[PDB]
Symmetry: D2
Subunit: 229 residues, 4 copies
């Protein structure tokens, strides 16, 4: 999987996801910094907050590059806060829009890049899908996003093989973790991007070190360490 998020002045979904020369559209078939999986063709999702702060989501189980509707409509959807993703799944896992990030609890949008043993996670009746990312999202939402660092550090200890890159947003804040996969940040005059990988060659891109939490709010960017055992 690859994901991208925006917090700042209104930006179109197309401008963030489709239009950049190495953005999510390109990453669906030719990602640059992806160690696990060749591509991200098992679905996609784009979530945003409208003027009234309502979380809205377009999700699909198809390759992003072939979605003519999104290509047509995305330029007309603008938001101060966006989380989008393209999905990669091991052969045999369920293909369904409910399994594509971003997940939502109504307040937060959330994407997971990685893998986790569902056996170490609590059972839940609140997940959007059966896929590991949805079970993990349910746990994260249950604990609260203010506790994201704790949740990820804990799950990372329960499953030493897990990769736990989270990217989340609530309309006025971004949260992310690096735990076994990539993330970069771009600070623009008008807002902040977090992305699995840079969507162009802007010299402003900087890479987030592994095992960190990123917290973006009030024009501040915090990159702070997570607990390791």
């Amino acid at each position: 999987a690859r994901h991208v998020a925006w917090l700042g002045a209104p930006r179109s979904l197309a401008d963030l996801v489709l239009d950049p020369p190495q953005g999510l559209l390109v990453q669906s078939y030719a990602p640059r910094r992806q160690k696990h999986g060749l591509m991200n063709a098992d679905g996609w999702g784009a979530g945003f907050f409208d003027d009234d702060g309502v979380a809205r989501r377009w999700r699909s189980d198809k390759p992003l590059w072939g979605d003519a509707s999104f290509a047509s409509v995305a330029p007309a959807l603008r938001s101060r806060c966006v989380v989008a993703a393209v999905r990669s799944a091991t052969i045999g896992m369920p293909i369904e829009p409910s399994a594509s990030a971003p997940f939502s609890d109504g307040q937060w949008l959330l994407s997971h890049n990685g893998l986790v043993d569902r056996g170490v996670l609590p059972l839940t009746g609140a997940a959007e899908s059966t896929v590991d990312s949805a079970i993990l999202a349910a746990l994260i939402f249950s604990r609260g996003l203010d506790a994201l660092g704790a949740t990820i550090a804990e799950v990372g200890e329960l499953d030493p093989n897990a990769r736990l890159n989270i990217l989340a947003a609530n309309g006025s804040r971004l949260l992310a973790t690096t735990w076994g996969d990539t993330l970069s940040v771009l600070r623009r005059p008008d807002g902040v991007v977090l992305a699995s990988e840079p969507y162009d060659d802007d010299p402003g891109w900087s890479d987030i070190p592994d095992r960190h939490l990123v917290d973006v709010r009030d024009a501040h960017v915090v990159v702070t360490p997570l607990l390791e055992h």
Copy 2:
């Protein structure tokens, strides 16, 4: 099929298509004035013009009522000019979003409710799909929407069993034909609705007689007969 169009002040796709008590969402499974087909569950589409006049379209091969993405996003999509439809197809016909109205030539959005023998229509290399409505749309676009009434009269004489209800828009105009199926008009304070059937029980709804052309601009509604 059932379709609906809006021309007026900015209106959300949800407000036009999903929210009314008997609007297109409800018509996908329980239409009230549909003589042909039980439902409209073979796909859907919603086209609109953005602030720069660009025609944009969301189309699907699935039942409208089940599309969680559209239900979530439609309230955030607002436009002065919308054409939307829900598709019904006889069993065996191809199911694919390219076959769902509205069709487009970049300037005009167009929906067809009815049936026409592709055998009487010209062959084309410009259709979006193989289905009869797409072949008919290609013809209509080729003749130009200013000739819509004449084109429909022509096709109607070529295929006396054809039903040829067209609903089209270019961002500042609506055009529609009645030819064998239903159409109604609602004049609101802020714009005009044209629809296969009323989306509620507003007393302002009036029915368009069969074999007529409807022309809407700047909330002016002109209804004229088609050629005999």
Copy 3:
């Protein structure tokens, strides 16, 4: 929802599902004895057991009537034991093949016609989907099909508003419950059909009364009541 099952000498999926004049194909848009939902256009599924006893499944999130692939291929798929369904879901529920019956635990195929409050069911890590029927299937599989009648009575007391029509098969047995919806049986010389409603007007169809269990094995059809509350 409507479902149908077969146990006997081999019959093709088309023969059971598509070809009868009032079979599952027709029921996807024009059911005859369906009190809840106008139609069954939210997906479909056909499960069968092959010659080696392996459970195989074709599932979809599309209306059965439009599925050109199934219409083409179904006549070539023959089995001694079949469970098939067409899905109907209330607006807003997840549309995905994993949510379409039949569900499977590898030994049993299972379809549910009705609805149940997921809040009264146990949490599980074994569900195929988040839909209520999948959570219910997980419970049924966990309790064992030999306890089906008792499990359904129990759930029926936990949720007095639930409808709990189950149809299940393991290659050599059918099991079914009536709990708020319809079921009929047809005894042919070559096997037994159980179905939500008759797929034709054969006078041989018999209706199963509500709140009963049906057990088909060794060419015997045994119908028994369920527990009192």
Copy 4:
């Protein structure tokens, strides 16, 4: 696109398409001999002839690798004659099962790997989709498969940039053309495979030269240049 065909003793769709270590399933995300397109994730199809000679088809607009239904059912579908394909399309082209090979006229199954300018082909009302492969399939069916070589030779001159790899079958015959893309043949004891590329490293695989017709029946493989 990549395609594969079988003519011989009954073989399951899974055995031909899913199970080989470098078969169509793998080619959907990691083809080995494909110059055009990185993958074949824009749909798939598997056509076969049943015991009574009826042509049947399963087609999809999704990536082959993710189709749980096909993975489950394919081992139970056996046939003496199969044509299957995975589709690749440039970004923006219609995604729809009607556009996925194999196409059919009821007698013949047909797959096209390549590209052709629809502008040089006759208009048609008989195509299954609007995509160039479907327009070409319509022309080929119209002319008749007994004329496949002549039709492909003609279209290849009408459009000197066209790539026109056809793989077709009627239950008792395979026909194929090489015209700008790859094709290999494997002769097994129980039948013949034709494929865009070898599905394993069997030493029996041999490559068909470009601009040739391949005609398979009665376990004879006749390879001739196109006239």
